[PDB]
């Protein structure tokens, strides 16, 4: 409510509620984090970063964004831990503090915010933005079909009313628009994290593509040490491997365009579960899938800080 010690992590929350929490966060921590905007959802609303830095220019940054899918609300409610774990654990957690000391981190809660405003007061399962284009009754573009990356080709639809609509060009959204020049401008990033759900799964790039990138070997013995970690907590079961050899072929997406930049860390995570609930996972999942996601990151976090 009035106290970031006193907010509920164990339920879900609208807009309006997660970003009174950055405040909330920024005011009682002003020395670790800062609220950035990056830029307007189509409809207007501010689209927020949190920078977490101990200091430096531009040090190397590790992005984590969540989501950018409105109905992936388990990626949101992550976020929102995380962000308060980031501030309890620096000074206490030896490893996560090394990590503070010599990167910063960068993470956006609420991707979409337009889609994540329009699940709470009309469709609970909307996916894309909510971007209108004359010749359509349709609204909305898949925003993780949106990237400069194999844009348009196998993988996305090319009708407007598809919940896989890629949209009229790459980065016609200013929601992926915001996050490229942003990315572009910093060009420090080490490290680029996606976080959706559902599948329990734990993929790197190429999704458009059969062609293998040239860290496969590295990136797939990251993914594994990650997965080992999560899995440690509760037994939480993770399969990893590449977008395309794992679920299908998809163009247009984030990680795929963030490796093309030159940044090599760049994984996808897909949360809980592996269908029961599916989207409308129950609050009381929340904590438990915050944690176990919480020990995958960090692992991919020191792999960075040391490479
Ligand atoms: O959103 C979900 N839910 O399972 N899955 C992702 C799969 C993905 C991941 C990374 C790159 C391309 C495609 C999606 O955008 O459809
Ligand atoms: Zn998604």
């Given at each position: 409510?009035?106290?970031?010690?006193?907010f509920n992590y164990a339920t879900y929350h609208?807009?309006?509620?997660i970003?009174?929490?950055?405040?909330?966060?920024?005011?009682?921590?002003?020395?670790?984090?800062?609220?950035?905007?990056?830029?307007?959802?189509?409809?207007?609303?501010?689209?927020?970063?949190?920078?977490?830095?101990?200091?430096?220019?531009?040090?190397?940054?590790?992005?984590?964004?969540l989501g950018?899918h409105?109905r992936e609300w388990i990626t949101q409610a992550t976020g929102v831990w995380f962000?308060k774990k980031?501030?309890?654990?620096?000074?206490?957690?030896?490893?996560?503090?090394?990590?503070?000391?010599?990167?910063?981190?960068?993470?956006?809660i609420?991707?979409?915010?337009?889609?994540?405003?329009?699940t709470?007061?009309?469709?609970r399962l909307?996916?894309?933005?909510?971007?209108?284009?004359?010749?359509?009754?349709?609204?909305?573009?898949?925003?993780?079909?949106?990237?400069?990356?194999?844009?348009?080709?196998?993988?996305?639809?090319?009708?407007?009313?598809?919940?896989?609509?890629?949209?009229?060009?790459?980065?016609?959204?200013?929601?992926?628009?915001?996050?490229?020049?942003?990315?572009?401008?910093?060009?420090?990033?080490?490290?680029?994290?996606?976080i959706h759900s559902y599948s329990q799964l734990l993929?790197?790039?190429?999704?458009?593509?059969?062609?293998?990138?040239?860290?496969?070997?590295?990136?797939?013995?990251?993914?594994?040490?990650?997965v080992?970690?999560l899995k440690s907590l509760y037994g939480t079961s993770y399969?990893?491997?590449?977008?395309?050899?794992?679920?299908?072929?998809?163009?247009?997406?984030?990680?795929?365009?963030?490796?093309?930049?030159?940044?090599?860390?760049?994984?996808?995570f897909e949360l809980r579960d592996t269908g029961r609930y599916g989207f409308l996972l129950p609050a009381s999942q929340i904590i438990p899938t915050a944690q176990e996601t919480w020990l995958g990151v960090?692992?991919?976090?020191?792999?960075?800080?040391?490479?």
């Amino acid at each position: 409510a009035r106290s970031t010690n006193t907010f509920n992590y164990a339920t879900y929350h609208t807009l309006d509620e997660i970003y009174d929490f950055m405040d909330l966060l920024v005011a009682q921590h002003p020395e670790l984090v800062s609220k950035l905007q990056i830029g307007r959802s189509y409809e207007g609303r501010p689209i927020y970063v949190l920078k977490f830095s101990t200091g430096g220019s531009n040090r190397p940054a590790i992005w984590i964004d969540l989501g950018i899918h409105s109905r992936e609300w388990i990626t949101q409610a992550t976020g929102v831990w995380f962000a308060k774990k980031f501030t309890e654990n620096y000074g206490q957690n030896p490893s996560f503090t090394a990590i503070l000391d010599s990167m910063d981190i960068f993470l956006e809660i609420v991707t979409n915010p337009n889609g994540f405003a329009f699940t709470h007061s009309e469709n609970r399962l909307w996916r894309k933005t909510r971007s209108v284009t004359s010749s359509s009754l349709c609204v909305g573009v898949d925003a993780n079909r949106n990237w400069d990356a194999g844009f348009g080709k196998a993988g996305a639809s090319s009708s407007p009313c598809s919940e896989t609509y890629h949209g009229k060009y790459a980065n016609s959204e200013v929601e992926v628009k915001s996050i490229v020049d942003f990315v572009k401008n910093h060009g420090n990033f080490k490290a680029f994290l996606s976080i959706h759900s559902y599948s329990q799964l734990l993929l790197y790039p190429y999704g458009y593509t059969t062609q293998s990138i040239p860290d496969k070997t590295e990136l797939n013995q990251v993914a594994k040490s990650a997965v080992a970690a999560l899995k440690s907590l509760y037994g939480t079961s993770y399969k990893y491997g590449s977008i395309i050899t794992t679920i299908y072929q998809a163009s247009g997406g984030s990680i795929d365009w963030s490796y093309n930049q030159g940044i090599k860390y760049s994984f996808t995570f897909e949360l809980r579960d592996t269908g029961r609930y599916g989207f409308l996972l129950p609050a009381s999942q929340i904590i438990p899938t915050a944690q176990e996601t919480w020990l995958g990151v960090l692992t991919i976090m020191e792999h960075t800080v040391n490479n």
